[PDB]
Amino acid sequence: MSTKTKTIFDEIKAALVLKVIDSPLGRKLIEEKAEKQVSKTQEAITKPIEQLNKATGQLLFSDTNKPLHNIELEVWDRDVGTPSDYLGKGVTDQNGRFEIYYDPEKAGFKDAPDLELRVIDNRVTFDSDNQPVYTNRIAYIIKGGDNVTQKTYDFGTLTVPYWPYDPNSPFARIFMPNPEETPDDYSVGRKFQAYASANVLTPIKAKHTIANTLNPKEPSLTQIQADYPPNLTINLDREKPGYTRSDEYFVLRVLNGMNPCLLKRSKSDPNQFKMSFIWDNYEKDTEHDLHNVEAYFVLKDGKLFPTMITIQSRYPDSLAPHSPLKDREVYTPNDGEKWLQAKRIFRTAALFDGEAIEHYAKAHVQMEQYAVACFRNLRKNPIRLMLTPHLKSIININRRGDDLLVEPNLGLFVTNGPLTYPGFLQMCTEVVATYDWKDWQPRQPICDDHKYAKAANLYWQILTEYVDAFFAKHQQAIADEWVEIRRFSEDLVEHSMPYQPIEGIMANTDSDYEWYDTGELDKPDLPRATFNGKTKVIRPITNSNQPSATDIDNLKQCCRHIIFHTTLWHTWVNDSQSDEGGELAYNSLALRNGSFGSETDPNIAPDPIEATNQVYIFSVLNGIKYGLLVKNEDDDVPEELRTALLNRKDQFAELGIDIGNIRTLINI
Ligand SMILES: [Fe+2]
Ligand code: NA
């Protein structure tokens, strides 16, 4: 086997690299990498303006050719084999035009400056006394004329690749071939936690992988499970045997698990509920099985009990979408082990769906567009201070997932998922083509045990208070620089997906059943705009250069949406990955060879390498936990939000939630 040797050397290689980085050598390089990307903020050139010289011009985005507005510019002298010299500061106007006053005399050495224009980025931090701290970063450098001896030097109109859009993605994403040159890097802490976690967990996965080549049936599932730390379900079953396989727990995790199911209620019998996963739209891979599974529940006295689970499976042959299905089967809670096996199958469909749609699609992809637009257009406007800390760093993790999670042949969700890469992708494009911010609100609690709904609504009201307060406080500044909000809106609409009414797994085909709550769902009746000849999925926040009641409310809602999904939602879906899928016997992204058998059957379960990679990835992804609202390890979370969340600590406690476990952003 040609693959065995290279696989081994690759696992070894990975291990060694992690040794190097998770060490003094690695840490020094990381920390210094962080320190160099800080631009020393220069002081104003106080001197008579007549005695000063000037440089003028206009800056445009390289991809939209729109003005690069309100961005800081520094005039420097670039000298060969000599340190550069600072000559003057200034900003672009809303048309990207600039008239920088610079002093040639800070040349010192030469008779005339050889000009160099720097585009300057910056992050805002709050100090001890809650006052803004501006930390610069060099965004771009343009070479200007040499021997400049004119009292006005003009660059004219130039383009700048500032946060460019990826033209090869079906999604609005940043263009980042080299993730090593991100314009928004992680914190050194986030990096350190990552490399540490990986250094602990990777030698295990490596051991298993190397072991698998020596014997394709080894290591056992028992050995793989043992060699990793236990998860929630293992612990639970260690206290009370078989608890997590019970109906009560099945329902609880359907409601509040990693994939918190938005159930369908019956129109005739409002006590009847169901959840459908149908994959007729998608291409099955050759290894795993595919199951159209539907779980039915009844509501009795504020409790949800499972009534049946129907399973309709693809033949192993049935690869292409809409290929033949085996006869649908029906399972009730008294059908014993076939009932238990049905519950496991449902769990796996729910886990793969949860990772594709609820996680990767709804959280990562949907929020990246807001990130890119935000950092593209929000500078002078206070809303920046409100949005950036939640949208920062997400470009990094998505670009990483391009290799780690959703790579055409090596990514976990593709490989371990029952679909081909085109299938998984199709799920993603399908749902993201319908995600908008307008009139969006969290689902309502079906019952008292519906923890996620209660949690989500509480958090939502917190966000409402926060947003209202913030908008009130910075009203004048928000209005004064509303143009930024317009450019923000325009970038969002223009770069979003073309709208496409829902289809596939998340589309209801049932006449009897309707979504019990529609607040999170797509509102097709609400008008959407058109760009480039297609109706766009994201609705515009504004189309005027000054705010109005409508426009302001629009912005407030968009802000609520963004903050909600970048904090609580992603927290919930991501940090629940171990709890749902840490134990192989209980859950996986797919099943094999009929999917029916005892949960100890290694033929049904993932093969050793898929298994170990499953547990590895879940444990890593939930094991890295940097960036929490309460902890505020980056000192950039506006204090109003913090105090709003802290104020409501105990109501969250009453739902078994620590507000300190709520992440600030998406960076894992
Ligand atoms: Fe994530
Ligand atoms: Na696959």
UniProtKB/TrEMBL annotation:
One of its GO terms (molecular function) is oxidoreductase activity, acting on single donors with incorporation of molecular oxygen, incorporation of two atoms of oxygen. Keywords: Metal-binding, Oxidoreductase. Residues 297-409 form the Lipoxygenase domain. Fe(2+) binds at H359, H364, H570, I668. Gene3D superfamilies: 2.60.40.3330, Lipoxygenase-1, Domain 5. InterPro entries: LipOase (IPR000907), LipOase_C (IPR013819), LipOase_C_sf (IPR036226), Transthyretin-like_sf (IPR038479). It comes from the Bacteria. GO terms for biological process: lipid oxidation. This is Lipoxygenase domain-containing protein.
